[PDB]
Design a binder for this molecule. Structure first.
Ligand code: HEM
Length: 173
């Protein structure tokens, strides 16, 4: 379990919290991130195994992607997301087709690496009010590229299934 806590301390100060769809989150000054085996808000998720990635895609990703904790990557984003019942009712082949064949989530995002490093956390199965916690780190000079990527994905068929989403932006403290 990785716990994201909006509060008065932590490795990240919070630049901004803005609504995207559905209910937003309360303001806080800092974000702490920490492992755990079990305040304005607190959110938890789990880094997990691949649900959609195929081998050729994994190869393509690992060849360009960067890791967390880069000295220059002093800006970050946390985007909590919940998809609709209609999404979760669909079968695996139908979700994969929307995710990649129609939305090209992977193929269209590859150009943004290595600039944008990412980590995905899953939390539907632990009863959290979101389904995913998406975490991104980048240099200040790539922030406009980052907001551009985000706007691109938010225009996709995949995103028509998002029913709650919040925009949190951070600066390394
Ligand atoms: C920076 C470039 C990005 C790349 C290379 C990328 C790549 C991926 C990959 C390969 C997966 C699937 C993991 C799996 O097989 O389970 C994924 C899942 C996901 N990504 Fe992205 N992503 C990027 C940016 C973003 C952004 C900016 C967001 C949110 C605004 C986002 C939201 C998500 C979500 C919610 C999932 C889970 C999809 C699901 O399982 O229903 N990604 N991403």
């Amino acid at each position: 379990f990785t716990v994201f806590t909006g509060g008065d301390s932590g490795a990240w100060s919070i630049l901004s919290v803005a609504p995207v769809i559905g209910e937003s989150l309360m303001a806080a000054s800092h974000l702490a991130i920490a492992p755990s085996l079990s305040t304005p808000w607190q959110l938890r998720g789990v880094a997990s195994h691949a649900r959609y990635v195929e081998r050729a895609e994994k190869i393509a990703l690992t060849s360009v992607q960067a890791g967390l904790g880069r000295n220059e990557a002093t800006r970050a984003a946390l985007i909590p997301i919940r998809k609709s019942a209609a999404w979760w009712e669909m079968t695996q082949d139908e979700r994969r087709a929307i995710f990649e064949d129609k939305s090209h989530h992977i193929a269209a995002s590859l150009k943004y690496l290595p600039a944008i490093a990412r980590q995905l956390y899953h939390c539907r199965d632990i009863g959290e009010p979101f389904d995913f916690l998406t975490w991104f780190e980048y240099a200040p000079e790539h922030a406009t590229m980052f907001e551009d990527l985000v706007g691109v994905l938010r225009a996709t068929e995949e995103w028509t299934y998002v029913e709650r989403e919040v925009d949190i932006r951070l600066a390394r403290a």
